[PDB]
Structure formats: C-alpha cells, structure tokens
C-alpha cells in the first residue's frame, strides 16, 4: 500500500500508519469460476440451447451489425454493461461454433 503523506489535504492525505497485508477473506471469492459449476453450466447450455432474443442477437452478430445488436441487447436486458457482456458471450459461442465447423 502507498504510504500516506501526513497532511490533511492533497494526494495520499491522512495520518501515517504501518499498513498491513491481509490474507484474502473467503467472502470475496464470489464471482470466481469453479470447475464443477463451469462443467454444469456448459452441459446445461448444451441441453437447453438459446432464448429467442439470444437467437436474434446471435443472428445480428452473424450479419455483423454490432451496434444494432448492442442496442437490441440493451433494450432486452436493461443495462449497457449487461448488454455488452451478453454480446461478448454470444461472440464466444459463435467462435466455438465456427472452430467446430
């Protein structure tokens, strides 16, 4: 950690202490991928397939209309970041389907 300057204002302000390096708390592991949940999610994706809105976005991505796909994903899901993540996931499944074919 960066040492504090000992001043009340400016960059790195605050009282000087000897900062410690903590062992990482187990409650902050959430979001990390596990082998079992990765295997189960891949199998369930294979068994179930895709949603109609996902089919629309993957077809737009196949035609390469990326901006319209992002706009349609944002309209369907609600937020720009979730739309971007969904479009990246659909890009990855297009790439694996093409490397299979």
């Amino acid at each position: 950690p960066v040492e504090r300057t000992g001043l009340i204002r400016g960059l790195n302000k605050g009282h000087k202490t000897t900062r410690r390096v903590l062992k990482e708390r187990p409650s902050r592991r959430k979001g990390a991928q596990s082998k079992r949940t990765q295997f189960v999610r891949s199998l369930i994706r294979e068994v179930a397939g895709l949603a109609p809105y996902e089919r629309r976005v993957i077809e737009l991505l196949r035609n390469g209309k990326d901006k319209r796909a992002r706009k349609f994903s944002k309209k369907k899901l609600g937020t720009f970041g979730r739309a971007k993540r969904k479009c990246e996931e659909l890009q990855r499944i297009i790439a694996e389907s093409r490397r299979a074919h």
Binding site: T5, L7, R9, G10, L11, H15, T17, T18, R20, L22
Partner: protein
C-alpha cells in the same frame, strides 16, 4: 417552528418512571452480578479508533477482538467467548499499531485471568492451581480494562535545540500546494500523455 398540527396529545410520552426505571436497572444489575459471580459482569472489549475526520482523534471501546488479534495473542476463537472476551469477526486490522495494542491488551487479560477447573477433583494443566485461585478480583472490566488514554497528550516539552526546521516554503504554502496538486492531478496526466504521443509520432 411549532410542530403541533397533528394529534400530538395522543402520543405524549412523559417520564415520571425515571427513578423507578433506574431502581429496576440497578436491581437487574445486582441479579446479573450475583448470577455471574465470581466472573466480571461484562466482557473484555478492544480499543478502536472512531471513524470520520471529526472523531479520529479519540479512541473508544469496540465490539470485540479480531481473529488476527486472538491468533497473535494465542487464544483460540472457541475458548475466547467462554472466558469473558468479546469476539468480532467483521473487524479487520488494517494497521500494525491497533493490532499490537489489542494483542497487548489480550496478553494483560490472560496474565490477570484466573481459570477454575471444570471438575474440582481433576484440575488440568491449563487451569489455575488451588494455591493461586485466591487473589483480589475485579468485577468491572469496563473500569479495570478501560480506555486509559483516549486522546493524544496535548502538551509536551522539548529542548530548544530540538525545534524542527519545518516544511520548506511554509506550512500555509505547503497546504496550498497540496490542494493545487490534488486539483491538477488529471490535467497534468493528460498533458503528459499528449506530449508522449506527440514525441512518439514525431520522434
């Protein structure tokens, strides 16, 4: 500014039971002390520093000791609540000083602790022997292990030869410079990266 436009008389709370409630609280405290004797009536609490910039000058009692503090003081987390020590798993030790102070506090408590055996006929090696179970005892950990020095000492004497030179340029100028640099962090970074890009383009 009088807020009497509702039906305020339906929910007027008087406090004519203040001495009676004090007497009730004192009776409950006596009963709790008699039930817990010879243990103290309260648990051991750590020393923590108050948050925000208004109250960080002062220390006070916290909820409980951290797991790192207990591990450094050599007390297992399952034994700790059974011998009068409060345990708080949410609090962390971001700095060495508070950790060291609380470990010293726990070591002092463990040095002054008397531990009676579970069975009288069969004392164990971790238990206090019968010739050491007799001593003068305290019943208030908030008094015997309180916050001794809540604030920093406001007055200290140093020799005239040890007077510091001070910040070069002046303390007021140092504060103004720190504020100005903080306000101009991003502008200078944009200018530096633009200059670097121009140098890369026309090297």
């Amino acid at each position: 500014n009088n807020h009497f436009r509702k039906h305020w008389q339906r929910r007027v709370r008087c406090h004519f039971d203040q001495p009676g409630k004090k007497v009730t609280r004192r009776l409950a405290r006596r009963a709790k002390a008699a039930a817990l004797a010879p243990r103290p009536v309260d648990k051991l609490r750590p020393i923590v520093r108050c948050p925000t910039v208004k109250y960080n000058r002062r220390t006070r009692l916290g909820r409980g000791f951290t797991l790192e503090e207990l591990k450094a003081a050599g007390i297992p987390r399952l034994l700790a609540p059974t011998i009068g020590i409060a345990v708080d798993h949410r609090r962390k030790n971001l700095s060495e000083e508070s950790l060291a102070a609380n470990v010293q506090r726990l070591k002092d408590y463990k040095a002054r602790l008397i531990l009676f055996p579970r069975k009288s006929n069969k004392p164990k090696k971790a238990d206090t022997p019968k010739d050491q179970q007799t001593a003068e005892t305290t019943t208030s950990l908030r008094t015997s292990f309180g916050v001794e020095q809540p604030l920093a000492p406001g007055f200290t004497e140093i020799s005239k030869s040890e007077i510091p030179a001070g910040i070069e340029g002046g303390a007021y100028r140092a504060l103004r410079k720190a504020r100005s640099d903080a306000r101009l962090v991003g502008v200078r970074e944009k200018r530096a990266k633009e200059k670097a890009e121009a140098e890369a383009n026309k090297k």
